[PDB]
RNA sequence: UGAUAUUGAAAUUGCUUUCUAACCCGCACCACUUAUCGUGGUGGGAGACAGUGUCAGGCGGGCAGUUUGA
RNA sequence: UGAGUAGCGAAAGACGGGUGAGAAUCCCGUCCACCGAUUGACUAAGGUUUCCAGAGGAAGGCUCGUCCGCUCUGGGUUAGUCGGGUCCUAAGCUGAGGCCGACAGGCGUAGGCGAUGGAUAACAGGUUGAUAUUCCUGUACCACCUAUAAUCGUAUCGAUGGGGGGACGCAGUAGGAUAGGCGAAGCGUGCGAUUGGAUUGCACGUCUAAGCAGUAAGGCGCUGAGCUGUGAUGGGGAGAAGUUCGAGUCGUUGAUUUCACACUGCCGAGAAAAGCCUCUAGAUAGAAAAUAGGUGCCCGUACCGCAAACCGACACAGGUAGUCAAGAUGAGAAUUCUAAGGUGAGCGAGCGAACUCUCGUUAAGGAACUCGGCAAAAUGACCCCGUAACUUCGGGAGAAGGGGUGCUCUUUAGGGUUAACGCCCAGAAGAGCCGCAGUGAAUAGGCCCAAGCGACUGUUUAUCAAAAACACAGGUCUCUGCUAAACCGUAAGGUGAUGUAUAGGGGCUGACGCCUGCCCGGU
RNA sequence: CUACCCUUGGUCAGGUUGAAGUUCAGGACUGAAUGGAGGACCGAACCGACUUACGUUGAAAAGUGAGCGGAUGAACU
């Protein structure tokens, strides 16, 4: 059976990367809210 | 300049020594042209060519806790005149 | 004319293609083609806003001129051709001092014609203030200098009725009687490729490689998908009127806002 | 669908006609500029109408909250 | 607790010798078996150091383990030409100005990013435990820099501008050529002890890019053209011989490769931009053919990659794009046995109880079973005859129903290739020999008579429903005159459509034949 | 993942039948050849999931065995 995660570096960085979070008001909210918690990895 | 950091002394390094080829670990941001002028400035030798390769950092433990080594840059200069 | 097919399977049984012996050359003129990617019923927002579009063969847009602007220079019909994206055929007309253009070919066209404010025979394109009453024209403008819009399909035509001082009265193919401003050009004749009406596409596959997807009837949808909704077993309409998918009376009701500025121009209905 | 602001000028009779400067044009041409965008000008069309604002009546399971006793 | 219970994840191992505290399992070896349009070779993604060597055996490994994709210590990835960037553009994304909008922001023009496509200069052999068009040897080509340059001069450079080209679908055969395959000549070894034989028996039979020509065909005296021959090459590989030596042939078959989207047919009418070549704008002003040298950046490159290393929590019968793809049998990439190369399944040893599962056979009967011939049997290949109703004239039709098939030897019109000889593909007929049986295994339609539904091919409830449901070609009614109607959005902007009533949206019906009656109370 | 779409690609052993058209002979039409159409036919790769068996603290949170359907297209990828 074909499962739901089919890894892809290009897609992963295009849809969850840093530059794609820094492009929205809400992506910036996401990164700020991960820094409030103090995560090690911000983006993916 | 001091872009050259270390000589490599391995089994394969010494093996290629016979072919008159020398290996160095250089800084992670240089060409193979800066390596060329650097070696020719330091050792006063004529360089025939220079290969270059990057190595990943590989994860090493030595204890409770994990972590990578350093990414390193392995240049290989083939001399034309002189040695070392 | 249409050419029958013998019933050798179930799917060419009742199916007629169109014969193409009014076509001269099969490859187009490279200087005039344009890419034309399929925006399959999706708008700029990416959403499907017109149903039943999608798929189909590739297309290369031919730059047809409907302006028909020239300083009374001659032309000459090189060759009729096929245009994948309109019912009518097109004709490569070369001009006297060496220009290439595409006209919509009216029926009976190989001669070589002109454009001007006053010549008239089939092919020419002149202003409606130089056309006598009873003539049939095609590819009429509506605003002076925009190209023609009306009577432009395959088998279309429009008679010039009488004339006002500033307007001329056209009878459209839908029975529409209208005033059109008397400086809007029009081409003489009828639009060829008249057999297009009679073709029988003959199979669901042939409908499907013209960019037409299956039209599901609203009566078999669920109640949240269509006003004709569900109901155990087949149910009738069960409403006072039929409704569109979006809750609009879809039969009989006049839905004409238009622009409410042609109303001083539209004499008759249809 | 009305009233009223943008909104003017003349006539017969609030109704009706005409006309240009407003407003408007997914009309043409020119310049920005080796841009089917936009802005400006010029020609043309429409024209105090449309579009828009505020008030009002109507239709309105298209969508919404709900009720549907013991 | 259940309980020393179920399970230990499809399958063939055996033995000898080692190593060792300890061996069914680790190493070696011989034999045996399994895959072989793949369990082999190479790659994209993805993983991310698992790759290699020397040590280790507390944990992981469904048992063991001296072993390991595990632990420790050291190592390993080499590019002017390979795949990306310093080239080009699709969809899409972003978009200064700009338009729209409670703010946030949406949209969008010039422009830019964006490969899965276009363009673009290197091949053969050797090598190490780990790289390999990268290192090394041999022979090349490309861009730029430099000096000498025979022959300087509107000769050079030419736009980001103009033009041509690039530049394109789908099917169908026909042809050329080559790869590969097969068979006999030249070499190279062995020549037998079980009856026999020595005309016997195995294994090999060449090789690049580039540069010189010139070449089926094709297109318009031009443009492109597979290919072949030559040197490259006194070089390298080479079964095998003793650092020194060693053959490299004609015959036939031939692709799914390539000429090549070529030619032809069709209708559904089949990307863009640059590199490229031109022309002048316009810089007013070198040599490219040659001689010699020189520089050439970044990123990836290890290993697995139908898998124990990727996605499934697992060392999981599942899923995973593309490339190469041999012999005998054949239409064939089918079936069966093998090649190349690779594997023997990470629990075993007994005994051969019930019972369950997979598989085989069965006297007489032959659906008597059951809700139902469900399951299993049967038929099945190629050549031959023969073939109903009905029908939209195509079909039904592989209708149904029957016959033949092995080996040998004779005669004997055949086909292709060749200067013939010689190979290659097809038979007729006749005479015989055998058996229970001759497509002797494997692979491979049961059929017929009727009724109902749907015309048909197709789609559907991922994970209990594949149908009579949906779609469909066709019919019809209805709206819409173009800034069309309809839909998305608050609007801008869009789609409809770079379309324009033979068109576009919506409702119902659903091939085709014949038909489609009455009513406007009411909504 | 999945449903539809857009752009750009790739895959689909083999064999059978024989539409128009055409040309030849006849006399609009006949027969012979040639041609090679089709959501044509049989059938592997590939894509499905009809039937039954097994499995159901599974090898697998949907699989396997035997058969089965499409297989140049409204195909698959």
Question: What residue has its CA nearest to the C1' of E512?
Answer: C14
Neighbours of chain C (3+ CB pairs under 8 A): none
CA gap C80, C102 in Å, rounded: 9
- Domain end call among C191, C213, C232: C191
Which residue segments constitute the domains of chain B, with CATH numbers given? 1-84 (3.30.70.330)
- Domain end call among C78, C96, C111: C111
Domain of C146 in residue numbering reads as 115-191
Helix, strand, or coil (residue A33): helix
Tell which strand D nucleotides have any atom below 7 Å from a protein Cβ: 27-29, 43-47, 49-51, 61-63
| E-only strand ranges, B1-84 | 4-7, 21-26, 47-55, 72-79
Residue C6 and residue C100 in one domain: yes
Q: Measuring from the CA of residue C181 to each C1', which nucleotide is nearest? A: D45
Structure determined via: cryo-EM
Residue C99 and residue C41 in one domain: yes
Q: Measuring from the CA of residue C67 to each C1', which nucleotide is nearest? A: D28
Residue C160 and residue C230 in one domain: no
Q: Measuring from the CA of residue C146 to each C1', which nucleotide is nearest? A: D27
Helix, strand, or coil (residue A35): helix
**Residues, chain B:** 84
Token digits for A17? 């990367």
Cβ-defined contacts of C107-110 (< 8 Å, 24+): C107/C189, C107/C190, C107/C191, C107/C192, C107/C193, C107/C194, C108/C189, C108/C192, C109/C77, C109/C80, C109/C189, C109/C192, C110/C77, C110/C80
CA gap C108, C91 in Å, rounded: 11
Q: Measuring from the CA of residue C259 to each C1', which nucleotide is nearest? A: E483
Exposure pattern of B57-71 as b/e (b: 16+ CB <10 Å)?
A: eeeeeeeeeeeeeee
Q: Please count the structural domains in chain C.
A: 3
Neighbours of chain B (3+ CB pairs under 8 A): none
Residue C223 and residue C125 in one domain: no
Query: What resolution (Å)?
Result: 3.1
Helix, strand, or coil (residue C243): strand
Residue C125 and residue C144 in one domain: yes
Cβ atoms C237, C143 nearer than 8 A: no
Phi, psi at C247, each rounded to 5°: 75, 55
CA gap A19, C67 in Å, rounded: 48
Give the other-Cβ count within 10 Å of C135's Cβ.
Answer: 16
Residue C106 and residue C1 in one domain: yes
Parallel/antiparallel/unpaired status of strands C158-163 and C136-138: antiparallel
Which residue segments constitute the domains of chain A, with CATH numbers given? 1-44 (1.10.287.3980)
What's the CATH code of the domain at C258? 4.10.950.10
What's the CATH code of the domain at C1? 2.40.50.140
Q: What is the dihedral of CA C112, C115, C117, C123, to 10 degrees?
A: 60
- Domain end call among C191, C213, C243: C191
DSSP sequence for C108-133 = S--S---BSS----TT-EEEGGG--T
Tell which strand F nucleotides have any atom below 7 Å from a protein Cβ: 1-2, 4-8, 19-20, 37-40, 60, 62-63, 73-74
């Amino acid at each position: 059976v074909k499962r739901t995660y089919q890894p892809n570096k290009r897609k992963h960085s295009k849809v969850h990367g840093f530059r794609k979070r820094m492009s929205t008001k809400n992506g910036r909210k996401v990164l700020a809210r991960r820094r409030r918690k103090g995560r090690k990895v911000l983006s993916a | 300049r001091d872009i050259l950091k270390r000589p490599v002394i391995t089994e394969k390094s010494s093996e290629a020594m016979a072919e008159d080829k020398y290996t160095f670990d250089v800084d992670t941001r240089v060409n193979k042209t800066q390596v060329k002028m650097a070696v020719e400035e330091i050792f006063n030798v004529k360089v025939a060519s220079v290969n270059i390769m990057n190595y990943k950092p590989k994860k090493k433990r030595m204890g409770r806790y994990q972590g990578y080594t350093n990414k390193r840059r392995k240049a290989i200069v083939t001399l034309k005149e002189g040695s070392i | 004319a249409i050419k029958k097919y013998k019933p050798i399977t179930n799917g060419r049984r009742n199916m007629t293609s169109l014969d193409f012996a009014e076509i001269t050359k099969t490859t187009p003129e490279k200087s005039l083609l344009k890419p034309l990617p399929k925006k399959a019923g999706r708008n700029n927002q990416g959403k499907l806003t017109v149903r039943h579009h999608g798929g189909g063969h590739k297309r290369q847009y031919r730059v047809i001129d409907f302006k028909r602007n020239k300083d009374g220079i001659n032309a000459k019909v090189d060759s009729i051709q096929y245009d994948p994206n309109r019912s009518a055929n097109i004709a490569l007309v070369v001009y006297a001092d060496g220009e290439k253009r595409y006209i919509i070919a009216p029926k009976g066209l190989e001669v070589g014609q002109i454009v001007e404010s006053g010549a008239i025979k089939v092919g020419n394109a002149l202003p409606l203030q130089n056309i006598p009453v009873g003539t049939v024209v095609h590819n009429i403008e509506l605003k002076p200098g925009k190209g023609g819009q009306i009577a432009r399909s395959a088998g279309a035509s429009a008679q010039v009725l009488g004339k006002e001082g500033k307007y001329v009265l056209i009878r459209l193919r839908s029975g529409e009687v209208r005033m059109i401003l008397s400086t809007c050009r029009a081409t003489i004749g009828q639009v060829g490729n008249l057999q297009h009406e009679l073709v029988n596409v003959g199979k669901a596959g042939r409908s499907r490689w013209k960019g037409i997807r299956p039209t599901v009837r609203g009566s078999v949808m669920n109640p949240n998908d269509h006003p004709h909704g569900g109901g155990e077993g087949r149910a009738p309409i069960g409403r006072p009127s039929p409704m569109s998918p979006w809750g609009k009376p879809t039969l009989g009701k006049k839905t004409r806002r238009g622009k409410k500025s042609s109303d001083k121009l539209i004499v008759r209905g249809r």
